[PDB]
Short mmCIF file of N, CA and C in Angstrom, two decimals:
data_model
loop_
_atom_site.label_atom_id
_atom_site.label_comp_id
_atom_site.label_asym_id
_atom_site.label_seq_id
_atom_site.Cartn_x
_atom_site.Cartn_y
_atom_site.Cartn_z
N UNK A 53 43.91 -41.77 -67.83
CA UNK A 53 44.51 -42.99 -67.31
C UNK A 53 45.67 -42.67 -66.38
N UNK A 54 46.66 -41.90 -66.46
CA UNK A 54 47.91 -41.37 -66.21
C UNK A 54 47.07 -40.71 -64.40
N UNK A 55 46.11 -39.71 -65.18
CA UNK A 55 45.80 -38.99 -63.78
C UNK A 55 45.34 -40.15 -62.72
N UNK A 56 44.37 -40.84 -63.41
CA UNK A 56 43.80 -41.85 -62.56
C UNK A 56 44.59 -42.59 -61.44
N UNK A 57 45.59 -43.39 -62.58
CA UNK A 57 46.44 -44.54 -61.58
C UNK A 57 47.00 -43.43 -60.67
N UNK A 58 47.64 -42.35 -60.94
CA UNK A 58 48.23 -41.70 -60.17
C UNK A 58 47.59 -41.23 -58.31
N UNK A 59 46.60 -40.95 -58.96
CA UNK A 59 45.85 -41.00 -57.46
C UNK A 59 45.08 -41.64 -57.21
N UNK A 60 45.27 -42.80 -57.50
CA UNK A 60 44.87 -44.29 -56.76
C UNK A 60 45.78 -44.59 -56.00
N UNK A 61 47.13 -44.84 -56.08
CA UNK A 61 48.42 -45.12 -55.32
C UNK A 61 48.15 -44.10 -54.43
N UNK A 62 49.11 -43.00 -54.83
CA UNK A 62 48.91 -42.25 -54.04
C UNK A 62 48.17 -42.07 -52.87
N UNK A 63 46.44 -41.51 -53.28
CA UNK A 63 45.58 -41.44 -52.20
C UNK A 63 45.36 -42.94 -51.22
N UNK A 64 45.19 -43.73 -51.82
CA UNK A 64 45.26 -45.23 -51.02
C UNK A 64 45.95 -45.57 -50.20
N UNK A 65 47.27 -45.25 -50.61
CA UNK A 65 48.64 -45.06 -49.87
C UNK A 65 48.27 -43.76 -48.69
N UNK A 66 47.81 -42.68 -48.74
CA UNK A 66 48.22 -41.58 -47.54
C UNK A 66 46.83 -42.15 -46.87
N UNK A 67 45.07 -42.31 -47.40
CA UNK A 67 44.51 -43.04 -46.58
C UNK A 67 45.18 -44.04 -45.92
N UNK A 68 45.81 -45.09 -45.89
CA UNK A 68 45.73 -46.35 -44.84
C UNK A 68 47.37 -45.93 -43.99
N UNK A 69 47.79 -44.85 -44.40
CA UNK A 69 49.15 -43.91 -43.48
C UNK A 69 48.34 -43.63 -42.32
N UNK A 70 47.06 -42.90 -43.36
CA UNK A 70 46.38 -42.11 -41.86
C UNK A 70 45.48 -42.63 -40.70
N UNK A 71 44.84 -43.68 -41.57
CA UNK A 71 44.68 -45.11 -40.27
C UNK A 71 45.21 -45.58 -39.34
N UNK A 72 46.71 -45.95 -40.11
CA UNK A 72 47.75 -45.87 -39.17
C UNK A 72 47.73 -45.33 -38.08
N UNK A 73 47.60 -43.77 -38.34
CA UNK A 73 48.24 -42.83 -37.19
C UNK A 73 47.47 -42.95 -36.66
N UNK A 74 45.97 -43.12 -36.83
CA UNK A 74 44.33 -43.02 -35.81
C UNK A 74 44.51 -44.25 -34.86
N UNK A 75 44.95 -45.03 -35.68
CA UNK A 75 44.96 -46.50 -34.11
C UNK A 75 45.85 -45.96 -33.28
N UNK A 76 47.39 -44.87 -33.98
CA UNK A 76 48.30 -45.17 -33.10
C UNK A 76 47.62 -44.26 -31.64
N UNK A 77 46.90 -43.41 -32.32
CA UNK A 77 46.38 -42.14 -31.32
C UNK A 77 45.75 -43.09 -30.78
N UNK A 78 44.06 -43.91 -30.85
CA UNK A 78 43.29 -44.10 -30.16
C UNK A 78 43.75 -44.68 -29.30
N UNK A 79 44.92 -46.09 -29.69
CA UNK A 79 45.79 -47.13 -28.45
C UNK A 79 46.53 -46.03 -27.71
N UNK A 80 47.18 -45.08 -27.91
CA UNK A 80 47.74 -44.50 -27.28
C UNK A 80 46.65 -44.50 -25.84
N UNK A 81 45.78 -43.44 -26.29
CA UNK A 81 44.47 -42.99 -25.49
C UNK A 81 44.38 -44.16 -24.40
N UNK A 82 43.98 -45.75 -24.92
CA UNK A 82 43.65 -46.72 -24.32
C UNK A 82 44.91 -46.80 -23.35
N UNK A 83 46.27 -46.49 -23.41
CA UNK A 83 47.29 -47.00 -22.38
C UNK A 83 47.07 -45.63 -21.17
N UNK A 84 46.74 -44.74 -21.78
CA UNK A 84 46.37 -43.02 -20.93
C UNK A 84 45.87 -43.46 -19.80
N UNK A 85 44.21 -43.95 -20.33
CA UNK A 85 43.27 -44.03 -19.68
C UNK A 85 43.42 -45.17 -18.78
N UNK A 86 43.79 -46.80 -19.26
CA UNK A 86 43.76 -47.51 -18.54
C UNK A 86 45.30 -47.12 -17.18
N UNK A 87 46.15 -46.40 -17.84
CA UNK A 87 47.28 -45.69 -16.72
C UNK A 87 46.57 -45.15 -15.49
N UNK A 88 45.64 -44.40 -15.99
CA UNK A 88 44.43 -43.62 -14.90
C UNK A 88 43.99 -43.98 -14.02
N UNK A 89 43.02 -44.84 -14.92
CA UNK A 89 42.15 -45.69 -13.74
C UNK A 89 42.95 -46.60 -13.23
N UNK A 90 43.97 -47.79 -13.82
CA UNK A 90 44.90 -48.01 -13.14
C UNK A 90 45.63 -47.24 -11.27
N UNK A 91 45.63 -46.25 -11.80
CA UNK A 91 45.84 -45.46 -10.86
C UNK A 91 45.17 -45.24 -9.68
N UNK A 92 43.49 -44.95 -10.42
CA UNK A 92 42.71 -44.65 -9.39
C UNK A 92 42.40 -46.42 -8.58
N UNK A 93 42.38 -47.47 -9.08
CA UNK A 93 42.84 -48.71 -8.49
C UNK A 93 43.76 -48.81 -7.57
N UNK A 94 44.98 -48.30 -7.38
CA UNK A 94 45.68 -47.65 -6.63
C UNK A 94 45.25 -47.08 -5.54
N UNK A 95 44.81 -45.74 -5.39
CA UNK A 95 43.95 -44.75 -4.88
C UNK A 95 43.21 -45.81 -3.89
N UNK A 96 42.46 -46.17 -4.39
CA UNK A 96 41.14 -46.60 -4.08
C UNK A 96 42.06 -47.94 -3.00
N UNK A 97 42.73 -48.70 -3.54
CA UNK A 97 43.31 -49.96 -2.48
C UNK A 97 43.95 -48.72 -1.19
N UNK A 98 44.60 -48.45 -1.97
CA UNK A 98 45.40 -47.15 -0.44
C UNK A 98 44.33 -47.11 0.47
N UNK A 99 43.13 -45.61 0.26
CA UNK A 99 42.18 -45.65 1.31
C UNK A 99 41.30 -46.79 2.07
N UNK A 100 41.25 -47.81 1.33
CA UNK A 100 40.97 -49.12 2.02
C UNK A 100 41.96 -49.73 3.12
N UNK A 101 42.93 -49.87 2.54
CA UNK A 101 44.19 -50.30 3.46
C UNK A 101 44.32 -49.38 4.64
N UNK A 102 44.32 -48.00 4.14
CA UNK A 102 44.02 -46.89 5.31
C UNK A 102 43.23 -47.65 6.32
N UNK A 103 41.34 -47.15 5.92
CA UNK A 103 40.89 -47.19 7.29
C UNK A 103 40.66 -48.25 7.87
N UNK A 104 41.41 -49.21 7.19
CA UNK A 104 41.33 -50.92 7.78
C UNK A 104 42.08 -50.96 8.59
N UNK B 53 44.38 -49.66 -67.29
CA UNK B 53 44.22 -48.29 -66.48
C UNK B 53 43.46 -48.87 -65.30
N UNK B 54 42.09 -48.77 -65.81
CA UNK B 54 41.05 -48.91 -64.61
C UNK B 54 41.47 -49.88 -63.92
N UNK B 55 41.50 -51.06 -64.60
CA UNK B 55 41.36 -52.21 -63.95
C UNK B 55 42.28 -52.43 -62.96
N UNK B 56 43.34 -52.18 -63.13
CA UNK B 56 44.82 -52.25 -62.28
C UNK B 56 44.72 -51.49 -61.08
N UNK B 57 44.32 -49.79 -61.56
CA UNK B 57 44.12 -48.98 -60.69
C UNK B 57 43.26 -49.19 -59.73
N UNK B 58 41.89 -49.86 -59.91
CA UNK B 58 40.84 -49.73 -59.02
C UNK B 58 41.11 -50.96 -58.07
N UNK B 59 41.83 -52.13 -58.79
CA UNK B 59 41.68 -53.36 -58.10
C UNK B 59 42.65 -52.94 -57.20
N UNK B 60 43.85 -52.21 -57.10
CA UNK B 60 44.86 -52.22 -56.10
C UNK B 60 44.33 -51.07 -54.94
N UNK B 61 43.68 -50.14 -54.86
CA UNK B 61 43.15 -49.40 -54.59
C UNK B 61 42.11 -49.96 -53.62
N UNK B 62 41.42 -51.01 -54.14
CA UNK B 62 40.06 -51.12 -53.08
C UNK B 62 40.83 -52.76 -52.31
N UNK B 63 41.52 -53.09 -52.61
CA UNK B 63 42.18 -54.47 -51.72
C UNK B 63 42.95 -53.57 -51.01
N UNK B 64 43.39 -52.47 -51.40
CA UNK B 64 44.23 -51.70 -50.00
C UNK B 64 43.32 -51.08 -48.91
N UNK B 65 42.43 -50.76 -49.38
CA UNK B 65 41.59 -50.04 -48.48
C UNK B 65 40.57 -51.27 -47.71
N UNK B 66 40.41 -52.46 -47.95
CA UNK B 66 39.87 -53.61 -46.91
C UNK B 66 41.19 -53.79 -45.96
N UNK B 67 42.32 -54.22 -46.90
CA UNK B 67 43.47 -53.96 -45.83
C UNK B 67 43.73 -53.56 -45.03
N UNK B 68 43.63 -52.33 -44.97
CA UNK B 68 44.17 -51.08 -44.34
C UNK B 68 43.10 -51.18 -42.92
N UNK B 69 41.78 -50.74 -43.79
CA UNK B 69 40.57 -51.43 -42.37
C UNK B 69 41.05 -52.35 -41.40
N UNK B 70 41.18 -54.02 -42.41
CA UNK B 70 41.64 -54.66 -41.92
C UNK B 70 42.64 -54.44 -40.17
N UNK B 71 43.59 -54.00 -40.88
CA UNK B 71 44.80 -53.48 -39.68
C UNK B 71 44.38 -53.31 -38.62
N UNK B 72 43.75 -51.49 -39.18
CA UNK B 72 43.14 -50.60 -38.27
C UNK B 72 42.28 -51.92 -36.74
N UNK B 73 41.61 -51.99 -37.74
CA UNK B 73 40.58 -53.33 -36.96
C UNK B 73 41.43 -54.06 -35.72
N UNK B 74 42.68 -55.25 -36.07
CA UNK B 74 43.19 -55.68 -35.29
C UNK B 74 44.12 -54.75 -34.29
N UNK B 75 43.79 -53.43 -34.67
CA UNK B 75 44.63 -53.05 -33.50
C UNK B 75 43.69 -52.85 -32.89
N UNK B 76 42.24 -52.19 -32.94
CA UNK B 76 41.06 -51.86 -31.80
C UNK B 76 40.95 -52.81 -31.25
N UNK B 77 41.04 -54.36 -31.32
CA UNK B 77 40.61 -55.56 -30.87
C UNK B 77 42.09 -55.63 -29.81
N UNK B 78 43.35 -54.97 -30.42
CA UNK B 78 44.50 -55.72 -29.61
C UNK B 78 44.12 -54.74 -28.79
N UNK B 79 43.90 -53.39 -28.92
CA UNK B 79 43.94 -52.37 -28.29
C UNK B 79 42.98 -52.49 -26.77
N UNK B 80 41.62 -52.73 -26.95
CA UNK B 80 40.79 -52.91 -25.98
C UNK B 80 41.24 -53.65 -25.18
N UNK B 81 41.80 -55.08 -25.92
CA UNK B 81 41.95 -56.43 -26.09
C UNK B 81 42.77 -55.79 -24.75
N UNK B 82 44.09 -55.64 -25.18
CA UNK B 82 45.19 -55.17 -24.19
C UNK B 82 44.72 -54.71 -22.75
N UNK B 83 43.81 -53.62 -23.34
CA UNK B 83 43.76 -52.51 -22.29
C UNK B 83 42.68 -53.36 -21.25
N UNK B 84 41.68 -54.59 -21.37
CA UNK B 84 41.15 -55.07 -20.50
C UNK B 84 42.25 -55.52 -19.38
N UNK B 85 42.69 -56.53 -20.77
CA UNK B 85 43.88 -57.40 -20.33
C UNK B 85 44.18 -56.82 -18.75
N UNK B 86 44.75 -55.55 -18.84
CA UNK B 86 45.55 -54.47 -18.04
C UNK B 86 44.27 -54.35 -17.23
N UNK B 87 43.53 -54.28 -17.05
CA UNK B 87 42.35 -53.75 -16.12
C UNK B 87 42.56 -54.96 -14.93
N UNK B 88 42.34 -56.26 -16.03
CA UNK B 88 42.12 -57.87 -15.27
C UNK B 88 43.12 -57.32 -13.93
N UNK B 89 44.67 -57.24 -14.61
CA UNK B 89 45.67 -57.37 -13.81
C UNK B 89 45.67 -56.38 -13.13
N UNK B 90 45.41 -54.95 -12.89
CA UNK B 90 45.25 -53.73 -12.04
C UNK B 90 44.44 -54.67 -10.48
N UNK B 91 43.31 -55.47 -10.68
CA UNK B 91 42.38 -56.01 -9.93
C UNK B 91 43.33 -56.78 -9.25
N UNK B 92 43.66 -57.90 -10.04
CA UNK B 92 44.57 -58.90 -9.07
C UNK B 92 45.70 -58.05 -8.40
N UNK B 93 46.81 -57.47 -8.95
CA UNK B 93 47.38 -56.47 -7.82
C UNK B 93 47.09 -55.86 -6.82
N UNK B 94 46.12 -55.06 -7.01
CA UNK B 94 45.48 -54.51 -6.02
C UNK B 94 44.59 -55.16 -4.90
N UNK B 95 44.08 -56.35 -5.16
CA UNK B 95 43.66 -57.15 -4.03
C UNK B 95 45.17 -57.64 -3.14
N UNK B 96 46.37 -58.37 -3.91
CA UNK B 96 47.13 -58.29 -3.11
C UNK B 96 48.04 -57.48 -2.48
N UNK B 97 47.46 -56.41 -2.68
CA UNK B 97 48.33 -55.26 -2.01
C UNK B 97 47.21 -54.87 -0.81
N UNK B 98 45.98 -55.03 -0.94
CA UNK B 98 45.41 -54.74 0.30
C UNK B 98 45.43 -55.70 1.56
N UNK B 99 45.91 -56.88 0.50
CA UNK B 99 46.57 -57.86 1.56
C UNK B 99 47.39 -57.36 2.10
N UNK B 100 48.31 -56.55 1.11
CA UNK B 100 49.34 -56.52 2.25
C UNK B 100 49.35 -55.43 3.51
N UNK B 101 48.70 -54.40 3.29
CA UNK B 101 48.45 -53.23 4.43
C UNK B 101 47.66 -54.44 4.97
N UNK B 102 47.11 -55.21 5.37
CA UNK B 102 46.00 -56.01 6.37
C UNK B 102 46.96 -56.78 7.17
N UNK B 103 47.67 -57.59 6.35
CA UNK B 103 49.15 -58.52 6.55
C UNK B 103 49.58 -57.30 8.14
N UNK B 104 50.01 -56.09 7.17
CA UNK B 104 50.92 -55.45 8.25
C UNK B 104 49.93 -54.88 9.83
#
């Protein structure tokens, strides 16, 4: 019983920590990427504006 | 024992999903968001090299 509850808290608790950190990574990723292509949106209006 | 242990244990872990979940939704959610607006900027910025 003792062992049990013990790593129920516990593990439950560092699983949904480590969820945590996975969204914080994947959103991270999502601001990266949309920064990027963002960018290449950029890029891409420039050479238009260019040879216009 | 069990009962306490398991019930707090598996309502944390829908939880936790839970979370995880609304951030992929804010996350995408966001990162379209940010795409939409990359578009509208960038059309008026090719306005503006045309403007000039």
């Amino acid at each position: 019983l003792d062992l049990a509850k013990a790593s129920a808290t516990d593990q439950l608790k560092k699983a949904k920590a480590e969820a945590q950190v996975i969204i914080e990574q994947a959103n991270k990723r999502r601001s990266q990427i949309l920064d990027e292509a963002k960018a290449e949106a950029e890029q891409e209006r420039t050479k238009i504006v260019a040879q216009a």
